[PDB]
Design a protein around this nucleic acid. Structure first.
Ligand SMILES: Nc1ncnc2c1ncn2[C@H]1C[C@H](O)[C@@H](COP(=O)(O)OP(=O)(O)OP(=O)(O)O)O1
Ligand SMILES: [Ca+2]
Ligand SMILES: [Ca+2]
Ligand SMILES: [Ca+2]
Ligand SMILES: [Ca+2]
Length: 901
DNA sequence: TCGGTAAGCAGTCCGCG
DNA sequence: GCGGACTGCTTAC
């Protein structure tokens, strides 16, 4: 097999590499890598190295890495560019793996771990590590085993061994319900003392050294806790055994408001799953506790126990250990679903970076572009300092707030990357500038043609047309991968709908789910067999179709994020290829494209409807247009349609056969106007929206920019079994809105779009009447909580104190003295509730850590003083009033002359 | 929250005769 | 009470 790296580090003048050799074996080597860097040299000199602009360079081979670094410094002291890859480990990988990496995940050791630490005096600070570590569960992907290290004797209690038989039993038998599929995979090791536990853990770690290290909050808690605890008990040298090269560094993580510390373990790649989730999941959660995220992703119940966690070990060690094991498994189950580890491996090896560098689009692209240029003996420029400067982004059209009955949307494919490719935007393809006209003049095709030679953007930039830039070349490669996966995702989604249809008529029989590849549209033979399946088989297939869809979503959306990251990196001062001329060339071209095609589509439709000056495009944002289709439907007449699906087909056919060719012609002209290298503005139909045939539903409404709802029947070729609400921006979509409130507002919108005014008034009246019964958590608002210190003045709100921060200060006064009450953590999220006048807490609101029950100390008083009226008005009525006035509806029946009968 | 811009709404503070 | 200037937070792209 072809070799591949596992990890790479620079330690002084040595590269330390762990890798898989040509026999599939894990090895480690130390290499005294001699880096090369580059300087410009005289034009008449025989060299094979040229910078990206074609200026000749001489290569400088250094005796070692420190010499190379020193040289860079002196080149700065002189005032001359020092060219080449200054991150020597990327040059090492480029040299050592000079081919497209083929990796085998089964050889990569992926460790998932979690620790427990009992603490009476509140949160066990990792940087202190003053309390014993009393449980570790470490799952190893190569052995497929959960290794459980259990402390039986502690200063906080001596306990009995954990029982695997009780762990397996149902909770109803007094057991812990550890999933039966992992019971045989547990290797249980009890210890008489913490020192033995930790020494055996290190020995284990040496034998089975993680390559990828993950878990939940491992980087901010488990890793520093374990390192510091071992450090405290044994000394530094023993703690450094967590690094396969015996090298570790305390690293300060700084943000705007302060900083924290993590431990860098050289020769390990830490991918903390909470961070993977935040980067790749495209959710925003009210809470990031493992129990909250598990429930969300997997529909598994919360891990239930009595008393505080600080007393769990002593009161119920059986459950304590079982929950530690289950916690480790829940991360594996989320990863089985989301496949973020697989994603990180793919992107990391593709770029030839340290796997953990997938968190940085700048590092990822720097390495892709460097490898690409290196293939042609080209030399990358030195990174420079730039002051941070604001620059302009997308155009968003101001919509007229209203109901909109029939709507078809269209959207440009991978816009920013497509612009890069079409225009040929790249550091080395800049050809010059032209004199810019107001954007309006380009939009209306009245400005002078920018160039007869070069490819242009309306920001004034011109680019070479003779060859592709490295940026267009490399972005195309990832775009093509993205396109493949989106295909599988969309096929899995269509297949899901076929299964949902068949579930209307499940067969009374005993059978099996079909063995199919959900990434591909079901054949006719498969569809026939489906129509004959039981509900149990069909549901199982649906679960599988939906997993396939999620896997595709992960693969496609994060490749989209990567290429969109390159367009954005051009406007980040830390990027080697930072250039506001290129960042703005992209965004400005996008503005033109949208408004250009708005004009074209209006012109096309005014023509086919025999009108003039009417606005058919009602809205647009960045790269999308929403077209009012009422008139198209009206030209046939509602009367002519058999059912909803009939007009959906008609609109689909109109968009494909009439609108899309018109849109294509408009963009080809624009390409010619701008003299671009390649026409890549492909704007396809996205949504077909409208009320159910014969209903009084309104179909859709806009309240403003980035705020709208539509009742969608077909999305990007997926024909839904049941219509789906596409709601953007509104409160149902915001993590800050209470859960029960999101749900009620969503049902109000459903009724508006699908059923009409009367149905809405029916539901509103009932919600208002019943809401005071709702569980307090479900009606709490949510907010991130920054600068609690800034606004704290002796425990009371300072000037300009934000509402949620006030709540925290209320909470802090109410729990003061209690070392054991849960603390609000700076920068994390809180639940927030308003409080009625004259309450014991002495203020108008209270907040506590999100994803938790508020401590028993005060729960009773909070429940009693909760201001339901304020809660209702703020989170429910006010947004509903916004929706309904926009839609010209009333959520309450207005009096009429009939109310005399 | 270590890892592109546009723009919405909540809330504070204060004006607005 | 509503709006503007401002901060804070959260979305849509
Ligand atoms: N998360 C993001 N980060 C950076 N730029 C973004 C992001 N989302 C959107 N943009 C910018 C770049 C996009 O090309 C453009 C239009 O967005 P959008 O329609 O969501 O995706 P897209 O057009 O790139 O892909 P798709 O093919 O799925 O439509 O807005
Ligand atoms: Ca725990
Ligand atoms: Ca798009
Ligand atoms: Ca059937
Ligand atoms: Ca879009």
């Amino acid at each position: 097999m072809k070799e591949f790296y596992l990890t790479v580090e620079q330690i002084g003048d040595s590269i330390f590499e762990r890798y898989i050799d040509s026999n599939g074996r894990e090895r480690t080597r130390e290499v005294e890598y001699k880096p090369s860097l580059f300087a410009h040299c005289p034009e008449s000199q025989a060299t094979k190295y040229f910078d990206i602009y074609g200026k000749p360079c001489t290569r400088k081979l250094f005796a070692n890495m420190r010499d190379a670094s020193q040289w860079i410094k002196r080149m700065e002291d002189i005032g001359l560019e020092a060219l080449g890859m200054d991150d020597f480990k990327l040059a090492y990988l480029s040299d050592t793996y000079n081919y497209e990496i083929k990796y085998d995940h089964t050889k990569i050791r992926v460790a998932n771990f979690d620790i427990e630490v009992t603490s009476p005096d509140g949160f066990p600070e990792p940087s202190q590590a003053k309390h014993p570590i009393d449980a570790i569960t470490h799952y190893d992907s190569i052995d497929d085993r959960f290794y459980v290290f259990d402390l039986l004797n502690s200063p906080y209690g001596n306990v009995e061994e954990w029982s695997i038989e009780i762990a397996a039993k149902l909770q109803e038998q007094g057991g812990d319900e550890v999933p039966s599929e992992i019971i045989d995979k547990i290797i249980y090791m009890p210890f008489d003392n913490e020192k033995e536990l930790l020494m055996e853990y290190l020995n284990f770690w040496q034998q089975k050294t993680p390559v990828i290290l993950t878990g939940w909050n491992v980087e901010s808690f488990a890793i520093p806790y374990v390192y510091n605890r071992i450090k405290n008990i044994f000394g530094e040298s023993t703690a450094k055994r967590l690094s396969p090269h015996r090298k570790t560094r305390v690293k300060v993580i700084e943000n705007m408001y302060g900083s924290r510390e993590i431990i860098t373990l050289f020769g390990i790649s830490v991918l903390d799953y909470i961070d993977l989730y935040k980067k790749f999941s495209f959710t925003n959660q009210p809470s990031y506790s493992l129990d909250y995220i598990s429930e969300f992703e997997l529909n598994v119940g919360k891990l239930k126990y009595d008393g505080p966690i600080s007393k769990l070990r002593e009161s119920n060690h059986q459950r304590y250990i079982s929950y530690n094991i289950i916690a480790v498994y829940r991360v594996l189950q989320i990863d089985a679903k989301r496949q973020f580890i697989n994603l990180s491996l793919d992107m990391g090896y593709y770029a030839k970076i340290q796997i953990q560098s997938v968190f940085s689009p700048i590092k990822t692209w720097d390495a892709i572009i460097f490898n690409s240029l290196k293939e042609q003996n080209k030399v990358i420029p030195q990174g420079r300092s730039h002051p941070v400067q604001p620059y302009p982004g997308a155009f968003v059209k101001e919509p007229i707030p209203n109901r909109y009955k029939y709507v078809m949307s269209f959207d440009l494919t991978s816009l920013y990357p497509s612009i890069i490719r079409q225009v040929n935007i790249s550091p080395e393809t800049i050809a010059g500038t032209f004199k810019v006209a107001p954007l309006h003049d380009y939009i209306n095709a009245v400005a002078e043609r920018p160039s007869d030679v070069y490819s242009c953007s309306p920001n004034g930039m011109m680019y070479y047309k003779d060859r592709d830039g490295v940026v267009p070349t490399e972005i195309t490669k990832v775009f093509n991968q993205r396109k493949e996966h989106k295909g599988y995702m969309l096929a899995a989604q269509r297949n899901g709908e076929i299964i949902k249809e068949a579930l209307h008529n499940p067969n009374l029989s005993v059978d099996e789910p079909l063995d199919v590849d959900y990434r591909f549209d079901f054949s006719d033979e498969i569809k026939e067999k489906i129509k004959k399946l039981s509900a149990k088989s069909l549901n199982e297939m649906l679960f599988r179709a939906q997993r396939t869809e999620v896997a595709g979503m992960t693969a496609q959306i994060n490749r989209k994020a990567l290429i969109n990251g390159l367009a954005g990196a051009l406007g980040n001062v830390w990027f080697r290829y930072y250039d506001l001329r290129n960042a703005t060339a992209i965004t400005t071209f996008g503005q033109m494209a949208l408004q250009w095609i708005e004009r074209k589509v209006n012109e096309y439709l005014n023509e086919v409807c025999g009108t003039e000056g009417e606005a058919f495009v009602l809205y647009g944002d960045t790269d999308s247009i929403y077209v009012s289709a009422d008139k198209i439907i009206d030209k046939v007449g509602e009367s002519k349609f058999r059912d909803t699906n009939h007009w959906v087909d008609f609109l689909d056919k109109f968009a494909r056969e009439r609108m899309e060719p018109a849109i294509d012609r408009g963009f080809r002209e624009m390409c010619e106007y701008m003299n671009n290298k390649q026409h890549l503005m492909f704007m396809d139909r996205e949504a077909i929206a409208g009320p159910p045939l014969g209903s009084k539903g309104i179909g859709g409404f806009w309240t403003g920019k980035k705020r709208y709802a539509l009742n969608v029947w077909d999305m990007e070729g997926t024909r839904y079994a049941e219509p789906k609400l596409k709601i953007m921006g509104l409160e149902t979509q915001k993590s800050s809105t209470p859960k029960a409130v999101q749900k009620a507002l969503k049902e109000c919108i459903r009724r508006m779009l699908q059923e009409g005014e009367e149905s809405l008034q029916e539901y509103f009246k009932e919600f208002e009447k019943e809401f005071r019964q709702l569980n307090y958590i479900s009606i709490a608002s949510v907010s991130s909580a920054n600068n609690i210190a800034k606004y704290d003045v002796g425990g009371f709100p300072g000037p300009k104190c934000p509402f949620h921060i006030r709540g925290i200060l209320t909470y802090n006064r109410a729990i003061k003295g209690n070392i054991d009450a849960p603390q609000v953590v700076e920068g994390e999220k809180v639940y927030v509730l308003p409080l009625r006048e004259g309450n014991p807490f002495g203020d108008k609101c209270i907040a506590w850590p999100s994803g938790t029950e508020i401590t028993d100390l005060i729960k009773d008083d909070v429940l009693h003083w909760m201001d339901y009226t304020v809660l209702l008005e703020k989170t429910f009525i006010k947004p509903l009033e916004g929706f309904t006035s926009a839609a010209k509806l009333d959520y309450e029946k207005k009096a009429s002359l009939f109310d005399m009968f």
